[PDB]
């Protein structure tokens, strides 16, 4: 798969986003290639092997 | 006598990519090691209010 | 100066683990339908010619005309593919099942993987795979080429236990190396269209000639310059045992045949050799001089 | 892409220093090896090294002689590299005097193995062979490592001398009375059928003919006897399926002025052989024919 | 009148302009230096000048869109000329000889027993058999054919854009990635149909393995020998093995619609043929996305047709009936507009 | 006589090089248009999404898919050819501004590039054949205003940092501006000033005249491309073809029991069984002319 | 149809021969009479004897 | 000896009109054979003309043309022609002299020309009672059926009344390959066809005594069980049962 959580630690730019009809749908109808959505607070961001 | 008046040539017109207005969509960037790179990926991390 | 090549690109993205699979085939033949310069991966390889109903002979007949090409150097985002020149030595990877000794005359054949699985799968990519033609010594091609033609002639006779067993014997060649059974062309009780047309090309030549050649041999044998056509008139009889005390003294010849149809039968005899010609004469495409240890690479002078 | 860049003449490798010199000029290190000039750098000839056991070296020390592989059954001696001369003992064309002459020369178990493996098989001779080219640079040891040309001219290293193809005189034949300016050499095995065994008769047929159809047409002229004997065996024996009666393979070419007699000299045994001199090798393949 | 009815489908190709729109900096195009490889035919040296480009997209949603702007002219004949199956399936023949001799002479198709290698090849595969005709005054031509029940309702089925197959197959309704449920909705007759909830408006096409399925599903057609050069307008409705595989989440679907949904059609020859795949412009086909087909103007009799040509601007759209005879009004006023507007 | 050929060869080389460079530029234009034509959904798709954006807060329910499909089918038949049916200026203007309002904003937008003189800021470009823009200049002459756009003048470059050579070799991966991440991670700061693709290119800008349109505070560029396809052998990618499958019954049988007859005051068919059962059907050609299928 | 053999449910395809075999669902009763008036019209028997 | 030359210079002797040297400038990169292969050839030995004979036989040409050295013309000018002998496996352009159109990927063959019939080319380059005939390059399938027609003419010729042979040859000579028609120039039964008659009847009769009992029977087995269009015509050529 694609390694996430590098993404939650590597400083990202920050940019005004724009998707018609919000984000959850266009992440749910497979507009984007790879995606992952977590609900609580996945402590994987904290594990660094 | 049978007269050949002037011989004539088509004069070509050059067009350039950046001169075109369609380049308003592109954001062209040279990258001399482009044949090496397999794929380029951009990752987005948007939290939902 | 740079060597002449043919660049190839993959419409579908490539994985880091995928591009490593190409470095394995960097020295392997990759047939191309047509000489061009830029080529999408779709037109690359033999997979475009896969069919469901069409069989081995379709692949062979189109494979004769495709432009052979080695892979040269993976670029990550591109692939070079050198077109071999006649009379210069090129190394080739041993995709064929059989090990090559030095001096062998190799030739290209469609892949002939049989039922139980062995190492086959490499480069699944977007519902697409890079099938590669077998490279095989000339005699093994001459033998495989006939095994299929005989299983085709038996495709009509699967009720019999004797043919049922003989087909199995033709199915498993026994070569000077590990053995490789040949897939049966017959399937679903019914023969594929290519082998059927080829078997017709053979049986027409086998039958149309027998009734036709007597009208000509009877006339040629008169001259006697060659001195064997009289002996050939007896060869026409197709008797196996010595003749009984009965009918045969001369071969059977057609009677009265209407003046024009004899031209049409004659020309239809020649139309069937053209259908058969793709299988009649295999052609060498490489002649290996030295072989690498483990018979894995070879360095063949190119032919064709 | 500049206008001048296409305008440049093609650059020959001798004008540029050797690639090893191009590295040593950059890094200045000086090995004991003389990489100032590379040997064998101008050779259109393609070659291959073949280990051949010492029982087969005789009459091959002279550069120029066919190498023919011979597949036989047994998995341990997978092949064996016969000369053209060693194959002459089996041929029916060769003179009995020449045959008994040279048969003494092959008094080795390695060579006698060749006669045994020739007798052993029911299947025809032309199937088991695959010509490899011509000898040069005999390694000449307890086991010679013969260098064999696959294509191009035979010649010395440094091109100081041109090796010549040697063909034993009894095998050499010419169809025509007026030789052309250039003529191709073809090797021709021709089975003449007979009861206990179909004995082969080898020949080497130089001719200006190149077209296959005209070549086989003229060939059936002299070989009408063998062809009619094949047809006669075809009807004499039922459920016997004997195949092709001669087989021709293109062996190369020579200028037809070079051809002239000579003799090989070995063990004080003179052997009369025709000598194509500047014989370029360009291998073909066995072409079955009736 | 024999017992059955026909429901010809017929694609028509329109030359047209597009207008694209795209945002600023909608996709970056990284490029490297062009490199010039060289070749020589010894009569002349071609040089080839490659260049590499990769286009990262720079928009989360769709940054660009398109509309069909202007139809200039029609390429297709819009004639009837139903497709000759005798050339689409050249190999098949009646077992009896005299009956097939008589049938060929009645249908107008015959083969001469020359065994020309062109005839051998054609019966074997392809060969582009038709060889265009003397003077084409209209253009490309085709029609298709579905043997059907006369009882077929039309007021619920033929007046409105709908599926020729007899059973609606819009994978957009079906749950995505649901093959067990997509195969029922397109095939099963116990589960109630889409648009009209009757099980099957035509049984002889909507069943799995019906005559029209085995006749036009290319997966079925392959097992019989058939000419692949000839383009069949109906097959897109019956290639069920592919459309079952097309149902995917909405955006994968509208990405698929831009890439494969096109159907190349050869443009110079008289009749439609499958082009050398992707060599030409691919022809977009919106009806493929919905798996429906648009009614065109049809009348049983000349009297109802005269009233249309004599009538007002809106005359062609209205459908009418007369005790047995009908007029199926067009959904799109192209017969009013592309023609009269000129 | 020989110097003439010596000069003619040089001129043929120069011609074969200038024309190939120009073919390269036109091929780059062509490929960038081919890319958009593969990433550009049709109008009705974007419009249905732009109308049903609110309701679908989650992966859409079984019912919402049916609403969306219905809207696709409706928009398709009422938007298929626009300059062909309608030419109402107030409606064509509404449709074109609807096309711009339906397109989503790009990730990165550099204020400096493509700025019209006098403070205007461009948003996108729309392209079409000549005969289309000639209709638009007539219908919207009030809004189109030729202006001097400040386009970027040179390709950018994306040079590799020294640290990237190691990560490319050991790990087969390259993150842009590795050295900036090392600083922001050590210093603990979360945001990045720029994400490197806006970092590269377009430092030097040059003017060029363009036509722009006001679409409700949007300024879209209008650009014809037929200029680059004159006398070429490649078909314009914007000219396309559209197939439409049609279907018609022939030889049906309407019920006798529940039979009925609207118009009958108009026609009067002769009493005959041939008038009773339909056996044929009638259509019309590309040019209007009666056509028959028996 | 699906006939029932010796504890099997073997399927049985069988030619329809006459046009009348089509089910009265697909070729209704009045349809055949209308079609027969077509044939008696074709024979010039529109008023039958 | 001096090895075979790659570049060969041809010199005309007869006075060349300014009109005719222009035909050769349009004739560049054509396939022109020579028998001799020296470095400085005469114009007399150019092309096929030297082998025209009173016999007027087409097969004599097909046979003598096989032996000639094919050369590709190059760098034509006043006073000089520069024929090139091609090397095996190396690419070359080839000018399309004949009307036949060349499909991509097709192989080519060299056979003596087959005049259209009613019309002939004017720019023959005839001079001094020496016409410049050159062999046609045709796609392989057409070169196959021209020879198949010639051989059928040779086989049918024997054992048939001379009037019947006229009716057959009247049609066996015309060929409609690729929608163009062509006609064999004076095809004549000869000794050159006779030896081929002998070899064809011999190989085709030894074929009859090599097919197995099942190999001949396969068609009977096929038709009794399955039928298709290919099989209909093969049921016809099988005369009776």
Coordinates of C-alpha atoms in Angstrom, one line a residue, chain E residues 40-43 90-91 93-95 97 101 104 111-115 118-120 123, chain H residues 28-29 74 84 91-93 141 176-178 225 227-230 232-234 236-237:
Chain E
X40 CA 19.9 5.4 -41.6
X41 CA 18.3 3.8 -44.6
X42 CA 21.5 4.5 -46.6
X43 CA 19.4 6.3 -49.1
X90 CA -19.6 -16.0 -43.2
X91 CA -18.9 -19.5 -42.1
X93 CA -24.3 -22.6 -43.8
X94 CA -27.4 -24.9 -43.8
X95 CA -26.5 -28.6 -43.5
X97 CA -27.0 -28.1 -49.9
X101 CA -28.4 -22.6 -52.5
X104 CA -28.7 -17.4 -50.8
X111 CA -20.2 -16.9 -52.8
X112 CA -18.4 -18.1 -55.9
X113 CA -16.5 -21.4 -55.5
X114 CA -13.1 -20.1 -56.5
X115 CA -11.3 -20.8 -53.2
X118 CA -9.2 -14.0 -50.2
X119 CA -12.3 -16.1 -49.8
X120 CA -10.4 -18.6 -47.6
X123 CA -14.2 -17.3 -44.1
Chain H
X28 CA 16.7 6.5 -58.8
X29 CA 16.8 3.7 -56.1
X74 CA 21.9 5.3 -56.8
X84 CA 24.7 -0.4 -55.5
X91 CA 17.7 -1.5 -44.8
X92 CA 17.1 0.2 -48.2
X93 CA 14.3 2.2 -49.8
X141 CA 0.9 -13.3 -52.8
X176 CA -7.1 -9.4 -60.6
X177 CA -4.8 -9.0 -57.6
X178 CA -5.6 -5.9 -55.5
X225 CA -20.0 -34.9 -38.3
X227 CA -20.3 -28.7 -41.6
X228 CA -19.4 -25.1 -42.4
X229 CA -18.7 -23.0 -45.5
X230 CA -15.1 -24.1 -45.9
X232 CA -18.9 -27.1 -48.7
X233 CA -16.3 -26.4 -51.4
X234 CA -14.0 -29.1 -50.2
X236 CA -17.1 -30.3 -54.2
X237 CA -13.4 -30.8 -55.1

